[PDB]
Design a protein around this ligand. Sequence first.
Ligand SMILES: C=CCO[C@]1(C(=O)O)C[C@@H](O[C@]2(C(=O)O)C[C@@H](O)[C@@H](O)[C@@H]([C@H](O)CO)O2)C=C([C@H](O)CO)O1
Ligand SMILES: [Zn+2]
Ligand SMILES: [Zn+2]
Lengths: 213, 217
Amino acid sequence: EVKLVESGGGLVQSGGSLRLSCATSGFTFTDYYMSWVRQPPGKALEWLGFIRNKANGYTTEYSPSVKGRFTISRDNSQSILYLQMNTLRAEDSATYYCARDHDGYYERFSWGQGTLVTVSAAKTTPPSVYPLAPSMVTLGCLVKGYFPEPVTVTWNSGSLSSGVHTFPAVLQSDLYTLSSSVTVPSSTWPSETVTCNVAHPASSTKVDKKIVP
Amino acid sequence: DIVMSQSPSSLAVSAGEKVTMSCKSSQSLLNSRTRKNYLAWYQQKPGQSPKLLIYWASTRESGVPDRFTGSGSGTDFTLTITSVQAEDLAVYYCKQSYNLRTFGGGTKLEIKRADAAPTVSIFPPSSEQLTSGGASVVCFLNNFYPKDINVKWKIDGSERGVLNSWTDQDSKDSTYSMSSTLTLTKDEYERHNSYTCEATHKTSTSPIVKSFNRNEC
Ligand SMILES: C=CCO[C@]1(C(=O)O)C[C@@H](O[C@]2(C(=O)O)C[C@@H](O)[C@@H](O)[C@@H]([C@H](O)CO)O2)C=C([C@H](O)CO)O1
Ligand SMILES: [Zn+2]
Ligand SMILES: [Zn+2]
């Protein structure tokens, strides 16, 4: 099983620097070129650069959009890919993906989950998490007033996923708010517990909020 | 340089129907030596990373359903989906790898389905919010189609700090959902009694009305 996992994303100020990592497994790392691609919220994918395989001396190439400012490197002992970003600007705010690239034969990117980078002067603000309690019954959690993105919301630690709607965050007055609804049979709540699990990585916030009648 | 362009920007198609989308390069992607077109297609479902579907213009990656077919050559390429399914909702990107790599701007595919009325639910502010001086009232309008919908808030019968958010289309039932949040100060919240979310959607000339009264909490 191939695995690519980005890390390093978060909040950084304009003019500042940040380095992302991409840990890989499940394939012969040195045989492969590796690319970085980014995606601003709601916008298209943008290829940023690659680092070639061993046969090609692990050389780098970059899009003109970031050449001179971004640097790619790799650790071939541990199979980790890196992206060094300098002189960051608002336009660099995006989800950054690593992707496995060329092996000398195939033309394809055979991707990580992505790590979100936010370039802003705003401070880190943890969310407030509030329960939403009133056949089938609908419950929810309001995740209010946080910065930067993202947050994650699960219900009963992942065991409720069907009947879940998580509403995209919207920015108002320099803070994000999102909500999530879960719909279950009335026979099961409040008989059984329903809990939303909320995380905000920027503030290392972890919240479990039980929906109480 | 190599400019990649896609068409359409977006479209909607009913389940079972055929989808056709296009990708153009400013320069031929046909490599003389290998005789292959260096053009790949990726599918990006809501909240997910892109996934490889097609490469070398027409080679379908293992695990990808047969209903996806890549075609074309040189400067012009096509991704065709036959018998589209609800789960095919996604943005589709083409990407050249002839000279470094460049993505097109994507085609957003939505799924058309039968009109569906929303299920509306309203939620009073929690005591844990009120204690800090704020009062948010939330209304969920769930599983409707089409996407256009109107929400009005009424307080003591009078129309009125509102945060609206729509989900992406659902991959299973092709509906939308939206959340509407009205936020007041506790002081203002305590001056009124009836809080009402009213949803008007083309599925009925009657608004769906959900309310609660502060005195009943
Ligand atoms: C970099 C100079 C020559 O590179 C080629 C060549 O024969 O021209 C091709 C090259 O592969 C790449 C590359 O730039 O590294 C990546 C590949 O995915 C594709 O983009 C091709 C491009 O289509 C050109 O053919 O370029 C690799 C080298 C060989 O490894 C050795 O020289 O050859
Ligand atoms: Zn639903
Ligand atoms: Zn008033």
